[PDB]
Design a protein around this motif. Structure first.
Motif, PDB file in Angstrom:
ATOM      1  N   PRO A  92       9.501  12.108  -1.286  1.00  0.00           N
ATOM      2  CA  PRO A  92       8.767  10.971  -1.869  1.00  0.00           C
ATOM      3  C   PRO A  92       9.571   9.792  -2.396  1.00  0.00           C
ATOM      4  O   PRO A  92       8.998   8.915  -3.044  1.00  0.00           O
ATOM      5  CB  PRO A  92       7.987  11.623  -3.014  1.00  0.00           C
ATOM      6  N   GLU A  93      10.884   9.772  -2.180  1.00  0.00           N
ATOM      7  CA  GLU A  93      11.587   8.498  -2.098  1.00  0.00           C
ATOM      8  C   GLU A  93      11.078   7.690  -0.909  1.00  0.00           C
ATOM      9  O   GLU A  93      10.825   6.478  -1.004  1.00  0.00           O
ATOM     10  CB  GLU A  93      13.081   8.752  -1.927  1.00  0.00           C
ATOM     11  N   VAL A  94      10.908   8.367   0.223  1.00  0.00           N
ATOM     12  CA  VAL A  94      10.669   7.687   1.484  1.00  0.00           C
ATOM     13  C   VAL A  94       9.245   7.159   1.545  1.00  0.00           C
ATOM     14  O   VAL A  94       9.006   6.028   1.998  1.00  0.00           O
ATOM     15  CB  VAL A  94      10.984   8.659   2.631  1.00  0.00           C
ATOM     16  N   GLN A  95       8.285   7.953   1.068  1.00  0.00           N
ATOM     17  CA  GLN A  95       6.888   7.547   1.114  1.00  0.00           C
ATOM     18  C   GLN A  95       6.636   6.349   0.219  1.00  0.00           C
ATOM     19  O   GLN A  95       5.884   5.440   0.587  1.00  0.00           O
ATOM     20  CB  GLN A  95       5.987   8.706   0.709  1.00  0.00           C
ATOM     21  N   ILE A  96       7.304   6.290  -0.930  1.00  0.00           N
ATOM     22  CA  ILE A  96       7.097   5.129  -1.777  1.00  0.00           C
ATOM     23  C   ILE A  96       7.878   3.924  -1.275  1.00  0.00           C
ATOM     24  O   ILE A  96       7.454   2.794  -1.528  1.00  0.00           O
ATOM     25  CB  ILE A  96       7.424   5.435  -3.245  1.00  0.00           C
ATOM     26  N   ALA A  97       8.962   4.115  -0.513  1.00  0.00           N
ATOM     27  CA  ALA A  97       9.587   2.959   0.135  1.00  0.00           C
ATOM     28  C   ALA A  97       8.675   2.354   1.204  1.00  0.00           C
ATOM     29  O   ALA A  97       8.547   1.119   1.312  1.00  0.00           O
ATOM     30  CB  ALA A  97      10.923   3.368   0.744  1.00  0.00           C
ATOM     31  N   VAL A  98       8.033   3.219   1.993  1.00  0.00           N
ATOM     32  CA  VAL A  98       7.093   2.770   3.018  1.00  0.00           C
ATOM     33  C   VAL A  98       5.912   2.050   2.384  1.00  0.00           C
ATOM     34  O   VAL A  98       5.537   0.945   2.804  1.00  0.00           O
ATOM     35  CB  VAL A  98       6.632   3.965   3.866  1.00  0.00           C
ATOM     36  N   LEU A  99       5.333   2.656   1.343  1.00  0.00           N
ATOM     37  CA  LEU A  99       4.254   2.017   0.604  1.00  0.00           C
ATOM     38  C   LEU A  99       4.694   0.718  -0.043  1.00  0.00           C
ATOM     39  O   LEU A  99       3.886  -0.200  -0.169  1.00  0.00           O
ATOM     40  CB  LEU A  99       3.714   2.955  -0.468  1.00  0.00           C
ATOM     41  N   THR A 100       5.968   0.613  -0.426  1.00  0.00           N
ATOM     42  CA  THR A 100       6.476  -0.611  -1.031  1.00  0.00           C
ATOM     43  C   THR A 100       6.444  -1.768  -0.046  1.00  0.00           C
ATOM     44  O   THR A 100       5.911  -2.845  -0.350  1.00  0.00           O
ATOM     45  CB  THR A 100       7.900  -0.383  -1.530  1.00  0.00           C
ATOM     46  N   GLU A 101       6.994  -1.557   1.149  1.00  0.00           N
ATOM     47  CA  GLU A 101       6.968  -2.638   2.133  1.00  0.00           C
ATOM     48  C   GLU A 101       5.549  -2.947   2.593  1.00  0.00           C
ATOM     49  O   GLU A 101       5.205  -4.124   2.814  1.00  0.00           O
ATOM     50  CB  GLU A 101       7.849  -2.291   3.318  1.00  0.00           C
ATOM     51  N   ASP A 102       4.706  -1.913   2.674  1.00  0.00           N
ATOM     52  CA  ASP A 102       3.312  -2.109   3.053  1.00  0.00           C
ATOM     53  C   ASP A 102       2.563  -2.945   2.029  1.00  0.00           C
ATOM     54  O   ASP A 102       1.803  -3.844   2.400  1.00  0.00           O
ATOM     55  CB  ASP A 102       2.624  -0.761   3.230  1.00  0.00           C
ATOM     56  N   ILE A 103       2.761  -2.673   0.739  1.00  0.00           N
ATOM     57  CA  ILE A 103       2.031  -3.453  -0.246  1.00  0.00           C
ATOM     58  C   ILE A 103       2.606  -4.846  -0.368  1.00  0.00           C
ATOM     59  O   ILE A 103       1.853  -5.766  -0.707  1.00  0.00           O
ATOM     60  CB  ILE A 103       1.964  -2.795  -1.635  1.00  0.00           C
ATOM     61  N   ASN A 104       3.890  -5.037  -0.036  1.00  0.00           N
ATOM     62  CA  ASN A 104       4.419  -6.395   0.057  1.00  0.00           C
ATOM     63  C   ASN A 104       3.681  -7.207   1.110  1.00  0.00           C
ATOM     64  O   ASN A 104       3.133  -8.274   0.809  1.00  0.00           O
ATOM     65  CB  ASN A 104       5.918  -6.386   0.349  1.00  0.00           C
ATOM     66  N   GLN A 105       3.597  -6.693   2.334  1.00  0.00           N
ATOM     67  CA  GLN A 105       2.967  -7.520   3.360  1.00  0.00           C
ATOM     68  C   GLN A 105       1.444  -7.573   3.234  1.00  0.00           C
ATOM     69  O   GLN A 105       0.836  -8.584   3.606  1.00  0.00           O
ATOM     70  CB  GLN A 105       3.378  -7.055   4.749  1.00  0.00           C
ATOM     71  N   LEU A 106       0.808  -6.534   2.687  1.00  0.00           N
ATOM     72  CA  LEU A 106      -0.622  -6.631   2.422  1.00  0.00           C
ATOM     73  C   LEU A 106      -0.918  -7.619   1.316  1.00  0.00           C
ATOM     74  O   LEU A 106      -1.942  -8.305   1.357  1.00  0.00           O
ATOM     75  CB  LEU A 106      -1.205  -5.271   2.065  1.00  0.00           C
TER      76      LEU A 106
END
Lengths: 275, 97, 66, 117, 88
Positions: free
Chosen positions: E24-38
Motif C-alpha cells: 500500500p505504498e504503491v496503491q496510494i501512489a497510483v491513487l495520488t496521480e489519479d486524483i491529481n489528474q481527476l
RNA sequence: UUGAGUGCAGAAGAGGAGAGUGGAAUUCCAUGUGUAGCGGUGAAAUGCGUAGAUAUAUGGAGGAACACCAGUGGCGAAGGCGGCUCUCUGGUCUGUAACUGACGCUGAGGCUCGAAAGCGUGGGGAGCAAACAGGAUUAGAUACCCUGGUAGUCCACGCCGUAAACGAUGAGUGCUAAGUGUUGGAGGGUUUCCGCCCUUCAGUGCUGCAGCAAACGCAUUAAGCACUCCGCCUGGGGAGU
C-alpha cells in the motif's frame, strides 16, 4: 472583471469599477501621440453648441489604424494598453519592416500573435480582409462605409455584427439593433467583435467621478424658468400641460423617426427595427 | 495508441477535374501538417442523391482514412476548413475500429 | 422459428452496405420493429445507429411515397 | 380556357367542416367548394352528402374550362372522404391518385390541452 | 484516466519486491496521480457531478489505506509522507 | 486467506460535461392563382376575410422540441437519463489469482448533490400558457365551453432547499421447496450452432411451498429465520400553531 469597494462612507456605497487585469504596461511611445483640446461644446464663434460638456483631466490623441494598407507583412503584437480616447482598449503594432502604430483589440488578442492584413489572409480574429474574401457567418468590424477611408462603423467596446447574404452588388450586413442594409463589395474590415465588455456594469457613484469624465450636470425640465424652457414655471409642482413633451427647441421627444426623408441611402436599407 | 477516422465529404459535381485534384491536394497537404497519418484516398462513387442538399441532387463521394493522436490539432483544423469552402456539401468524421 | 442476420457473419456494418441497409427499412421508409425483424437485441441498436447515420449523407431518404 | 385536362385537386377536412379545391400542376387555383359555401350550416358541415354535393358543384364549374384528368390530394382527416372522391367520379372525371400527405411532426411543438367539458 | 504506461511504471519504481501490485505504498501512489489528474478534470468540467463523486471516493479510500498503514509501522509511513508531499 | 482491496484478460450500458451539426412539423415574411367566406360548439355567438382571408405552390427567416426506433429494455444514489458526431471523464459485471495480508460495516453533529414551481442578474422568445379581456352556457359563474392574450415556459450565473423526493418497506451480512420468461457474461456436449440442449455467475419480472401476518397479503429481490450499526414512534384536536 469588477471590483466592489467595501462601504466606508455613505457615498462609496454603490461603487463598481474594473480591474484592468489585462493590461501589460502603461508607458506608451512618443511618436504615436498627438495633443488635443477640450472644445467644451464651443465653436469658432465662442458659443455653446451642445450642452453639458467639459471640465476634466488632461487627455491626448493617438494614431490608430483604420485602413491597414500594408499587406503581406506579418504583424507582431506585443502589448495591450489603455487609452483615454475610446471605450475599448488598444494594442501596439510591430511590422517586420519596422513600422509601428496602434490597432483596436478584439477579444482574444495575445502577446506574440501574428496578424495578416492582405486579401489572402487566413480567417482568424484580428486579420484584415476585403469583404469578398469572407464567407457567411463571421463577426466583422472596422467595416468601411466607402473604400479608402477606413473604419467608420462599429468601434466602441462590446457590440457585434453579422453577415447575412452575398449578392453580386451590394453585400448585406447585419448591424446592431437588427437593422440590415446594402454595403459595397470592395470594402476592407477586420474579423471579430470588440474586446472589453463590462461598461454596461460600472457605476459612477460620486458627482466627482462623472466630473472626472468630461461631463456636466443638467437641469430638469419644469425646474427651469417659465421662459428658458417651455415647461417651466409652475406653482408648487405641476404636471405638463403642453402635450407630447417638448425639447427646448420645439421637437417633441417621444417617437419622431426623423431622418431626412429623401436621403441617398434610403434605397439601401431594410428593417429599421429599433432606434 | 491512436485513433482511426473515415472522412467522406460531398463535392460539387459542376467543378472540373483540375479543381477536384487541387482540392484533394489541398486538404491532404493541410491534414498531414498536424501529425495526421495518411492511409488511403478513395474516390467512392459518382453518386446522385435521394434528396437535394444545397443546390444539387448529385455530387462526388470521396473517402479517406487517417490515424492520429486523439488530442492533436489534426481534427479541428479540418473541421474549421471544411464548411468554409464552397466545394464541400456535407462531410462526416467517425471513429473507426 | 425465426431467422437472423448472423449466418451471413455480421461483424461490422460500416455505414454504407445497401445489402443490409435496405432489408430493415419499411416500404414507406420507416423502421421495422424487432417483432418483425427476428434479430439480436444489440443488433437492433447497431442497425438503428447505422441507419441514423444513413439519413444524413443522402444514402437513404426520410420520406418516400413518390 | 386553354384546355389543360391535367391538374391537381385538393381535399381538406375537419371534424366540423371540409374544403375541396382543384388547381393546376403548379397549381394556380380554379374553382372550389365547401359545405358552408353551398350554404349548409355549422354543425351540419360534416355529412358526406354535403361533401357529395360540394364535389358536384366544384367539378361542374371546373371541367367546363377544359379539364378531364386530375390528381387527388387528401389533407385533413375528417369524415366524408369516402364519399367525396366517389362523388368526384360521379360527375365523370379521371381520378387516378390515392395518396396521403398528412402533417405529422417529429414532436417539435406542443399541442393544446385536454378538454375538461 | 491515466495511461497504462505510467500506470505500469510507477508500480515498477515504488515496489518493495517483485510483483507488488498490492503493497500500500504503491496503491496510494497510483491513487495520488489519479486524483491529481481527476482534479485537473474537475478544474475543466466543473459542472460534472459524476466525476467529483469519484474524487471523493478515491480520496476517502486513500485515507483509509493510509490510516491502516501507520498502525503496524511508522518508518514506511514517515518515508512516504516525506516522499509524496501530503499530510496536512 | 475465505472477508476486503490490487493485478490481468474482456463485455455491456439514454453516465456526465464541452463543441459543432442533421431532418421534418409549426409560425411569420415574399410571390403566383383564386374569389365569398374561413374558424369555433351540445348548439350558437364574440374572432378573422371585399385594404382579398381561408386554399395551393414556390423561396427566405426564426426558434422550439427530437417521429420511426422503444421494450416490465438499459444506465445512475435519488431527483432521473433517449436526433447525430467528436475532445475529456466516471462508475457496473464475468474468468483471473502469481501480489497486500483483515486494510471491514454502520455511522450523532458536519460536507456534497438535489424535479417542477420561485427570485436576482443578461440574452433570447415558435408554439403552449397562470393572471387579465371578450363571447356563450348558467337564476347566479370572476369556474367548467370558445376566441384571444401577459408573466412564465429556454439559454448563461448565483440564489432557495421543497414533492405522492413511493416499492409510503434504512443500510451491511449468512440459512431456508419450486416453476416461469428475460438482460449480460462464462463453461461443456452435439455442433458448419449462427441455428439447439445442459451447467454457473450479475440484474430484472410472473405464479407459488415452508414460514410470517388481525386480515389485506408477502415471499431468494421475504413483509421468514437471525446478528451489527443508524433513525423514528407512544390517542385524536388545539397545530408542526
Amino acid at each position: 472583471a469588477i471590483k466592489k469597494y467595501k462601504p466606508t462612507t455613505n457615498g462609496r456605497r454603490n461603487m463598481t469599477s474594473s480591474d484592468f487585469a489585462e493590461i501589460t504596461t502603461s508607458t506608451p511611445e512618443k511618436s504615436l501621440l498627438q495633443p488635443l483640446k477640450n472644445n467644451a461644446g464651443r465653436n469658432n464663434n465662442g458659443r455653446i453648441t451642445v450642452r453639458h460638456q467639459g471640465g476634466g483631466h488632461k487627455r491626448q490623441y493617438r494614431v490608430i489604424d483604420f485602413k491597414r494598407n500594408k499587406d503581406n507583412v506579418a504583424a507582431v503584437v506585443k502589448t495591450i494598453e489603455y487609452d483615454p480616447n475610446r471605450s475599448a482598449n488598444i494594442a501596439l503594432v510591430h511590422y517586420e519592416d519596422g513600422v509601428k502604430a496602434y490597432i483596436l483589440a478584439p477579444k482574444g488578442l495575445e502577446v506574440g500573435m501574428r496578424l495578416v492584413s492582405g486579401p489572402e489572409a487566413d480567417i482568424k480574429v484580428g486579420n484584415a480582409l476585403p469583404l469578398e474574401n469572407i464567407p457567411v457567418g463571421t463577426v466583422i468590424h472596422n467595416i468601411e462605409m466607402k473604400p479608402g477611408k477606413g473604419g467608420q462603423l462599429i468601434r466602441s467596446a462590446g457590440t457585434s455584427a453579422q453577415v447575412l447574404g452575398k449578392e453580386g452588388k451590394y453585400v448585406l450586413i447585419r448591424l446592431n439593433s437588427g437593422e440590415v442594409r446594402m454595403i459595397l463589395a470592395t470594402c476592407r474590415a477586420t474579423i471579430g467583435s470588440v474586446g472589453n465588455e463590462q461598461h454596461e456594469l460600472i457605476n459612477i457613484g460620486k458627482a466627482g467621478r462623472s466630473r472626472w469624465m468630461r461631463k456636466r450636470p443638467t437641469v430638469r425640465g419644469s425646474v427651469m424658468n417659465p421662459n428658458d424652457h417651455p415647461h417651466g414655471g409652475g406653482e408648487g409642482k405641476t404636471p405638463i400641460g403642453r402635450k407630447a413633451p417638448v425639447s427646448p427647441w420645439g421637437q417633441p421627444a417621444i417617437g419622431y423617426k426623423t431622418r431626412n426623408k429623401k436621403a441617398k441611402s434610403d434605397k439601401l436599407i431594410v428593417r429599421r427595427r429599433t432606434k | 495508441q491512436d485513433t482511426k477516422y473515415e472522412i467522406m465529404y460531398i463535392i460539387r459535381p459542376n467543378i472540373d477535374e483540375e479543381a477536384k485534384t487541387a482540392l484533394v491536394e489541398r486538404f491532404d497537404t493541410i491534414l498531414k501538417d498536424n501529425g495526421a497519418e495518411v492511409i488511403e484516398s478513395k474516390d467512392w462513387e459518382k453518386r446522385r442523391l435521394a434528396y437535394e442538399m444545397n443546390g444539387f441532387r448529385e455530387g462526388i463521394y470521396h473517402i479517406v482514412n487517417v490515424t492520429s493522436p486523439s488530442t492533436a490539432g489534426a481534427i479541428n483544423e479540418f473541421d474549421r476548413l471544411a464548411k468554409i469552402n464552397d466545394d464541400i456539401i456535407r462531410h462526416m468524421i467517425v471513429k473507426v475500429e | 422459428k425465426v431467422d437472423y442476420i448472423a449466418a451471413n457473419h455480421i461483424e461490422y456494418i460500416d455505414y454504407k452496405d445497401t445489402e443490409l441497409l435496405k432489408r430493415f427499412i419499411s416500404e414507406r421508409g420507416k423502421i421495422l420493429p424487432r417483432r418483425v425483424t427476428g434479430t439480436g437485441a444489440k443488433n437492433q441498436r447497431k442497425l438503428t445507429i447505422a441507419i441514423k447515420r444513413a439519413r444524413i449523407m443522402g444514402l437513404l431518404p426520410f420520406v418516400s411515397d413518390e | 380556357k386553354k384546355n389543360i385536362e391535367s391538374g391537381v385537386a385538393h381535399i381538406h377536412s375537419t371534424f366540423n367542416n371540409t374544403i375541396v379545391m382543384i388547381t393546376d400542376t403548379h397549381g394556380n387555383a380554379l374553382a372550389w367548394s365547401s359545405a358552408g359555401s353551398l350554404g349548409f350550416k355549422g354543425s351540419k358541415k360534416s355529412t358526406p352528402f354535403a361533401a357529395q354535393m360540394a364535389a358536384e358543384a366544384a367539378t361542374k364549374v371546373a371541367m367546363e374550362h377544359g379539364l378531364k384528368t386530375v390528381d387527388v390530394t387528401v389533407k385533413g382527416p375528417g369524415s366524408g372522404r369516402e364519399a367525396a372522391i366517389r362523388s368526384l367520379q360521379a360527375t365523370g372525371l379521371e381520378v387516378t391518385a390515392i395518396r396521403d400527405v398528412t402533417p405529422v411532426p417529429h414532436n417539435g411543438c406542443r399541442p393544446p390541452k385536454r378538454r375538461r367539458v | 484516466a491515466i495511461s497504462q504506461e505510467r500506470k505500469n511504471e510507477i508500480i515498477k519504481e515504488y515496489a518493495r519486491h517483485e510483483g507488488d501490485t498490492g503493497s500500500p505504498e504503491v496503491q496510494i501512489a497510483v491513487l495520488t496521480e489519479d486524483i491529481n489528474q481527476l482534479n485537473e478534470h474537475a478544474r475543466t468540467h466543473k459542472k460534472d457531478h459524476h466525476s467529483y463523486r469519484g474524487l471523493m471516493k478515491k480520496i476517502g479510500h486513500r485515507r483509509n489505506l493510509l490510516a491502516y498503514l501507520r498502525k503496524t509501522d511508522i518508518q514506511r509511513y514517515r518515508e512516504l509522507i516525506q516522499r509524496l508531499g501530503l499530510r496536512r
